[PDB]
Ligand binder design. Structure first.
Ligand SMILES: CC(=O)N[C@@H]([C@@H](O)[C@H](O)[C@H](O)CO)[C@@H](O)C[C@@H](OP(=O)(O)O)C(=O)O
Ligand SMILES: CC(=O)N[C@@H]([C@@H](O)[C@H](O)[C@H](O)CO)[C@@H](O)C[C@@H](OP(=O)(O)O)C(=O)O
Ligand SMILES: [Mn+2]
Ligand SMILES: [Mn+2]
Lengths: 348, 348
């Protein structure tokens, strides 16, 4: 597909690299460090490489209008949800340290200037911009100025809209990924449109391409790997019985382990070319391909024809089935036995 | 992707149709009808739509040379394997009837003229040509003359080689599918090259495209569905403890059920376009997108600027973040409160 790559800390991402699964803890901790650490533990023990947070600072990310508006996956205002779930700066610094103490990478999504600046003080190795902020060009400008790679989700946005964000990122000269995404919690399979990933790669040839997903299972992400995706994001929980608006579409340790295994298999299986010769098929080719044989007894001097020739396994005859018609009209140099392979010496 | 379709009996296959899984019993019955019927039962109970056989007639498909040649997945000659596993005509007619008695479709692969003619007497609704016969042009001509759709596997063959077979099929005027395939039993993930499917569709725009697979699990076939595959073939057994050269790469009832579920999900998720507007995202767009707000108290008569304006959720403000820069240089028509959304009435 392509050779685009960049590093998130010491981890290379790109088509020629192992896909990267981002375990999005997000707001799943419901504002509790005990719960957050239990989820980091679970991620670690499952084999995760990256844990992503959401950095919410209620007053800088929302005006008072947000106290009147309810998201699709809750029955209270988005302001109330964020007031309940948001970690303060001190606590989020502890979370980052904890994630790093487990040898994993910590990144986060910012939803405001104040959050961008907080994350820069913490010096995270890459910045996630959520689909809601994909068209937030002032915020994109700010984050791109930080000098680190950007992972940009592109739900709810057209190629045209995304173009302006990519323009800002390139000007700042940082590498970037684009994740195709659909922001319904949860998302039905029919709304995923994996082909959206192809649209993105075509429009933005220098982007690393992946999928951020909110379906109920791993199928969409697995398809994404097959199509060439390099980054996969699902929300993550230690257990599915947890409360919270995003828990329903979250993976857990077991399903994370499944995705990691599948992603590895599909990283190996994907791409390549039809005409590539595969050495291990040789024993099959040698028995399975056909050679030209006599379909009847043929007397010396008689002409070979489609009437007295046919083809049979295996492939070690002097004449391959590919050469069948070329023997038509040749002259038997000797008597030929029905069922025998036609030999070079059997023809004049 | 495309709108190519044809029917196998009453079952439509093509990109706009549910993918079709072919349960390849092949030689797995080791020549026993009891075992074959146990495998048909298992297929039926698992939810299979199609059971495929292999029609082996040892004397017409192989010359005596085959008694000296061993396949990659056995330690005895291919002749001995086929003598052991081949069902005679009477028995194969019983198998077909049994499959049809369970409401499933019966098809088979021929490896010889005699087998083609046997299958035509049985009037099967579509003919499978295995990868070994993909370059067997005389046999392809014969089968195409029968007037039924052809499913052609293309392992071990280049686009160039396949072209000659497609030419023969088109001349006969029957619809056809091409299955990408790698013929190692089993096949490592790295040798699958799913991109081979794209190569085929590009080269042969009128073909229905699928995958015939010999890996140890469902990952390759799932990837194939994501890429647009319409037909999936794996060998099938009622249980994995059975003896035989192809058992190791076979699916069983449980894994068939998994593939069917995955294929359905990925049929729904695949393709589509990035720019398609998804109604269910609307509640997310309404809270997540930003509007322009005052970043400081602005006195009446003062000029709006990037210094006193910023952006915040939610998206119901008079000015979207998209319009942010257009307010620069406008004149406050009244005092504006820090944190308030900029209203149309706030500017001259
Ligand atoms: C529109 C939005 O901000 N959605 C939140 C989501 O977790 C909400 O905070 C939650 O569902 C509110 O109920 C995340 O899905 C956003 C997420 O990015 P993506 O899902 O757009 O890839 C991120 O990087 O934080
Ligand atoms: C080269 C060949 O004929 N391989 C056999 C296979 O089952 C052998 O009979 C078996 O492995 C011999 O040990 C099948 O895989 C062929 C199979 O087609 P495909 O695997 O090329 O799609 C078919 O349609 O019958
Ligand atoms: Mn998300
Ligand atoms: Mn096969």
């Amino acid at each position: 597909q392509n050779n685009n790559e960049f590093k998130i800390g010491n981890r290379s991402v790109g088509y020629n690299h192992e896909p990267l699964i981002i375990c999005e803890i997000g707001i799943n901790h419901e504002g509790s460090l005990k719960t957050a650490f239990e989820m980091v533990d679970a991620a670690y023990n499952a084999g995760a490489e990256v844990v992503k947070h959401q950095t919410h600072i209620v007053e800088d990310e929302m005006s008072d209008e947000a106290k009147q508006v309810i998201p699709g996956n809750a029955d209270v205002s988005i302001y109330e949800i964020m007031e309940r779930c948001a970690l303060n700066e001190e606590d989020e610094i502890k979370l980052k340290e904890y994630v790093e103490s487990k040898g994993m990478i910590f990144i986060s999504t910012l939803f405001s200037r104040a959050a961008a600046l907080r994350l820069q003080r913490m010096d995270i190795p890459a910045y996630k911009i959520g689909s809601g902020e994909c068209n937030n060009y002032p915020l994109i400008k700010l984050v791109a100025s930080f000098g680190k790679p950007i992972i940009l989700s592109t739900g709810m946005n057209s190629i045209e809209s995304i173009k302006k964000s990519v323009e800002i990122i390139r000007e700042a000269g940082v590498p970037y990924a684009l994740l195709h995404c659909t922001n319904i919690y949860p998302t039905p399979y029919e709304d995923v449109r994996l082909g959206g990933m192809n649209d993105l790669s075509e429009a933005f040839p220098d982007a690393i391409i992946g999928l951020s997903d909110h379906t109920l299972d791993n199928y969409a992400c697995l398809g994404a790997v097959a199509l060439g995706g390099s980054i996969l994001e699902r929300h993550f929980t230690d257990r599915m019985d947890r409360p919270g608006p995003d828990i329903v579409c979250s993976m857990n340790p077991d399903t994370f382990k499944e995705l990691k295994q599948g992603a590895h298999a599909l990283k190996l299986a994907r791409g390549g070319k039809k005409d590539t010769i595969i050495a291990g098929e040789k024993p099959t080719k040698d028995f399975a391909f056909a050679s030209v044989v006599a379909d009847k007894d043929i007397k010396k001097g008689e002409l070979l024809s489609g009437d007295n020739l046919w083809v049979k396994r295996p492939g070690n005859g002097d004449f391959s089935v590919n050469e069948y018609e070329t023997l038509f009209g040749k002259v038997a140099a000797c008597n030929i036995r029905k069922g025998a392979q036609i030999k070079k010496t059997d023809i004049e």
